Amino acid sequence: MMKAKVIDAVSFSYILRTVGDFLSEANFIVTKEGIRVSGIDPSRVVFLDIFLPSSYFEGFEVSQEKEIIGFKLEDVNDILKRVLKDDTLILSSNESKLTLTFDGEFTRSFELPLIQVESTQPPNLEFPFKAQLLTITFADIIDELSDLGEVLNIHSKENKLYFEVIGDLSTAKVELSTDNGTLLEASGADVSSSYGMEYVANTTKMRRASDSMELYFGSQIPLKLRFKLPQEGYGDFYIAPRAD
Amino acid sequence: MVKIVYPNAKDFFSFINSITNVTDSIILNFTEDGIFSRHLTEDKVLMAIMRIPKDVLSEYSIDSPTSVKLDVSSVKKILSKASSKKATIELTETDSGLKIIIRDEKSGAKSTIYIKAEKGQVEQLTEPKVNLAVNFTTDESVLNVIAADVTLVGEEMRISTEEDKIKIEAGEEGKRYVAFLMKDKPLKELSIDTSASSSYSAEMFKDAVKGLRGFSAPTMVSFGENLPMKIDVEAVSGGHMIFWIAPRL
Amino acid sequence: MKVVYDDVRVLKDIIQALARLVDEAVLKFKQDSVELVALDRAHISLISVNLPREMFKEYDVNDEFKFGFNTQYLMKILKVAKRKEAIEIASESPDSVIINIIGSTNREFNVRNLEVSEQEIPEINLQFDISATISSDGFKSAISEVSTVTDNVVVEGHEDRILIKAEGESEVEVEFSKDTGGLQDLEFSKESKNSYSAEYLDDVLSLTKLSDYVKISFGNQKPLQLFFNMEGGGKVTYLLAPKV
Ligand SMILES: [Br-]
Ligand SMILES: [Br-]
Ligand SMILES: [Br-]
Ligand SMILES: [Br-]
Ligand SMILES: [Br-]
Ligand SMILES: [Br-]
Ligand SMILES: [Br-]
Ligand SMILES: [Br-]
Ligand SMILES: [Br-]
Ligand SMILES: [Br-]
Ligand SMILES: [Br-]
Ligand SMILES: [Br-]
Ligand SMILES: [Br-]
Ligand SMILES: [Br-]
Ligand SMILES: [Br-]
Ligand SMILES: [Br-]
Ligand SMILES: [Br-]
Ligand SMILES: [Br-]
Ligand SMILES: [Br-]
Ligand SMILES: [Br-]
Ligand SMILES: [Br-]
Ligand SMILES: [Br-]
Ligand SMILES: [Br-]
Ligand SMILES: [Br-]
Numbered sequence: 001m002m003k004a005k006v007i008d009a010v011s012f013s014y015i016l017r018t019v020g021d022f023l024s025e026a027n028f029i030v031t032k033e034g035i036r037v038s039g040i041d042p043s044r045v046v047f048l049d050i051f052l053p054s055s056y057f058e059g060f061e062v063s064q065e066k067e068i069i070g071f072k073l074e075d076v077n078d079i080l081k082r083v084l085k086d087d088t089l090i091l092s093s094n095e096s097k098l099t100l101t102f103d104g105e106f107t108r109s110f111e112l113p114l115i116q117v118e119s120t121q122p123p124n125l126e127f128p129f130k131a132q133l134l135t136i137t138f139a140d141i142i143d144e145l146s147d148l149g150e151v152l153n154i155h156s157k158e159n160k161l162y163f164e165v166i167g168d169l170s171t172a173k174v175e176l177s178t179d180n181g182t183l184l185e186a187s188g189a190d191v192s193s194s195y196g197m198e199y200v201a202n203t204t205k206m207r208r209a210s211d212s213m214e215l216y217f218g219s220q221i222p223l224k225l226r227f228k229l230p231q232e233g234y235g236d237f238y239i240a241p242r243a244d
Numbered sequence: 245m246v247k248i249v250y251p252n253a254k255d256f257f258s259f260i261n262s263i264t265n266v267t268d269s270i271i272l273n274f275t276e277d278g279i280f281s282r283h284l285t286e287d288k289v290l291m292a293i294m295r296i297p298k299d300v301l302s303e304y305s306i307d308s309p310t311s312v313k314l315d316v317s318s319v320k321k322i323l324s325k326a327s328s329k330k331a332t333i334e335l336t337e338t339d340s341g342l343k344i345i346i347r348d349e350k351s352g353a354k355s356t357i358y359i360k361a362e363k364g365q366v367e368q369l370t371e372p373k374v375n376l377a378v379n380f381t382t383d384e385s386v387l388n389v390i391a392a393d394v395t396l397v398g399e400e401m402r403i404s405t406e407e408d409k410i411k412i413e414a415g416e417e418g419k420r421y422v423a424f425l426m427k428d429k430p431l432k433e434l435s436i437d438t439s440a441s442s443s444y445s446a447e448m449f450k451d452a453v454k455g456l457r458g459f460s461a462p463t464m465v466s467f468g469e470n471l472p473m474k475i476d477v478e479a480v481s482g483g484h485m486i487f488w489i490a491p492r493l
Numbered sequence: 494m495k496v497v498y499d500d501v502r503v504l505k506d507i508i509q510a511l512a513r514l515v516d517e518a519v520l521k522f523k524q525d526s527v528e529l530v531a532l533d534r535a536h537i538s539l540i541s542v543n544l545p546r547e548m549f550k551e552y553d554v555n556d557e558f559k560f561g562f563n564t565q566y567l568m569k570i571l572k573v574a575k576r577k578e579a580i581e582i583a584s585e586s587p588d589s590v591i592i593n594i595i596g597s598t599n600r601e602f603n604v605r606n607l608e609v610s611e612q613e614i615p616e617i618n619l620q621f622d623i624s625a626t627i628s629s630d631g632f633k634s635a636i637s638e639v640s641t642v643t644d645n646v647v648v649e650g651h652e653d654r655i656l657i658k659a660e661g662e663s664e665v666e667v668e669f670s671k672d673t674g675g676l677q678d679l680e681f682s683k684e685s686k687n688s689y690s691a692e693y694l695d696d697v698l699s700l701t702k703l704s705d706y707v708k709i710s711f712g713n714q715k716p717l718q719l720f721f722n723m724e725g726g727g728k729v730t731y732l733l734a735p736k737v
Contacts, residue, residue, distance in 0.1 A: 082393055097418075105386065105430045106423060108393060113418035141598055144573040169605035170566065174598055182598050318663055321641040325634060351631035352675025355638060358664035
């Protein structure tokens with residue numbers, strides 16, 4: 001039996017909507033430090049890891065050392081799509097049911113029977129390049145480019161970040177630097193890699209739950225997107241590089 | 245001459261559009277009191293009533309009362325785009341049926357639509373004689389949240405009174421829904437005469453409230469113990485849109 | 494060559510219509526203006542564009558440069574801009590065109606220049622029986638309404654009114670006259686009536702955003718002419734053959 005209240009229910013709902021792009025089913029792993037969601041997509045290209053610390057919630061109470069709450073992303077998202085502008089959200093549970101309660105205009109409560117979901121967790125990593133930027137800057141650029149191709153090319157040059165889509169009779173390019181103000185910080189070697197555009201584009205909904213993000217990549221190593229949530233929360237997405 | 249002019253094409257189309265959630269074969273009744281249309285779903289569960297009194301009408305000329313039988317399936321697309329808040333709407337009888345005239349004050353466009361229609365004898369407007377012990381006022385937006393919530397969870401909606409609260413339930417298996425409405429959260433008004441409880445078709449409630457989206461005025465909802473639900477809204481420009489929902493059992 | 498235009502939105506409205514009409518087209522950059530003349534894929538209508546250098550923030554064009562492009566592809570590029578941000582079109586090499594969408598971030602597109610074969614259309618002057626000037630928004634509404642019930646837009650001209658009509662299973666008529674105030678100007682010679690393809694008229698409705706008013710010209714057995722006089726000296730003309 002647990003209970004967690006999110007004041008910004010809308011933003012929380014966009015995190016789960018993002019997870020829903022990669023997973024059909026998942027487990028909320030609930031402990032005294034907060035709630036964790038991990039999973040690998042069917043194509044096995046993306047591993048995702050979301051952690052919402054207890055302090056991320058307005059109220060947080062647990063009865064077990066470790067509670068595992070399996071859910072179907074479509075079903076949880078159908079409910080979360082019912083969220084109103086200024087709703088707070090309370091996630092609560094027992095043995096059989098997961099309850100989502102919206103509060104604000106009036107009080108509305110949905111119950112989903114738990115389902116049994118097989119657990120997850122795979123392989124700490126060194127990256128030769130790290131960038132820091134506003135999530136909205138990232139989201140805007142990736143939405144724009146996502147219609148232009150199937151592969152996103154990323155490379156660094158003298159602490160500058162480049163997003164590239166190589167098309168037919170066209171090539172699209174964006175320069176990200178501290179100088180042009182698009183990056184907050186960028187540091188590391190000159191490296192180059194490419195990733196599936198669909199996977200990267202799926203993370204752009206995190207703009208509604210995150211103001212700041214971190215970007216890590218290297219040659220033939222994953223693209224790591226860390227979306228910083230309040231109170232030390234994060235939404236991590238590791239995307240495998242396309243074969244070279 | 246059978247002729248009416250309504251001040252706001254957009255409000256008027258909201259009426260036509262509500263009635264359309266029941267049928268596309270509309271019967272307009274031009275009576276001595278104004279115009280009304282009333283239609284029921286095939287199972288007789290949902291009733292839609294458009295009632296526009298002659299006093300809220302900017303022009304009115306009904307020499308002999310008549311009903312007019314229109315298929316608006318194809319013209320409602322035109323009516324939808326031509327209906328502006330700045331436009332007035334005229335409905336006049338022709339030899340072949342009806343003519344709808346929209347005069348856009350902003351674009352200066354005059355849209356005239358001719359519709360073939362059967363003429364009939366004017367039917368009568370009767371509503372159920374029931375006392376609905378429970379009353380509340382809210383807006384369209386609240387009702388549409390509720391409708392979307394319940395239809396997601398199940399096919400039956402149970403509404404009841406729980407001591408100064410209205411309680412709404414749905415789901416008939418694992419997945420459930422519960423909502424509470426109370427004064428100022430979000431009820432504009434609430435009147436609980438005697439404890440009452442009833443169940444209705446979730447689909448029908450959704451079709452009833454889906455039409456109210458074009459009306460911003462306060463919406464009144466009334467029900468009783470195993471009795472029909474009445475949903476009532478007055479358009480800003482005049483006239484009432486009313487839905488009656490038959491109870492289950 | 495290099496040009497900078499500050500409202501990529503106006504360009505987007507033009508290319509949108511163009512992309513609904515034909516696959517490839519040529520933007521001809523000359524000393525005084527950018528020109529575009531294109532016959533739709535079926536050869537029943539003519540779109541003409543003139544953009545005087547006066548409306549461009551920067552205009553470095555010393556001789557005729559021909560920008561040949563895929564209309565659908567250029568449409569994708571112009572959509573990466575949302576609000577009032579600028580577009581740069583440049584070219585050092587005749588085989589290559591650089592498009593820059595300038596805003597929060599600079600989006601750079603490197604486009605291969607296309608060798609579109611053109612037919613140097615004759616500067617014909619046409620005699621119209623009527624010219625009516627009505628609001629562009631009004632025109633769009635009338636066309637939208639009539640198109641829901643017919644493929645045959647009947648246009649009718651009198652000394653005091655122009656009418657846009659559907660005749661068939663659903664009779665609809667939209668009037669712009671003296672007394673409705675919908676008629677801004679009228680040049681009357683002769684009573685006119687003709688029918689034009691609703692499909693092709695729908696293709697160019699984005700043009701109604703370029704100006705407050707559209708000058709409509711036609712006659713019996715004459716083609717339909719839509720003239721959009723934009724507030725910068727810009728000129729867009731659409732000429733459409735009678736139906737069938
Ligand atoms: Br989902
Ligand atoms: Br339970
Ligand atoms: Br797990
Ligand atoms: Br790592
Ligand atoms: Br490294
Ligand atoms: Br891949
Ligand atoms: Br989004
Ligand atoms: Br990997
Ligand atoms: Br009567
Ligand atoms: Br009334
Ligand atoms: Br409609
Ligand atoms: Br207008
Ligand atoms: Br009685
Ligand atoms: Br509706
Ligand atoms: Br209203
Ligand atoms: Br030249
Ligand atoms: Br010129
Ligand atoms: Br329209
Ligand atoms: Br004129
Ligand atoms: Br004709
Ligand atoms: Br348009
Ligand atoms: Br010009
Ligand atoms: Br022309
Ligand atoms: Br044709």
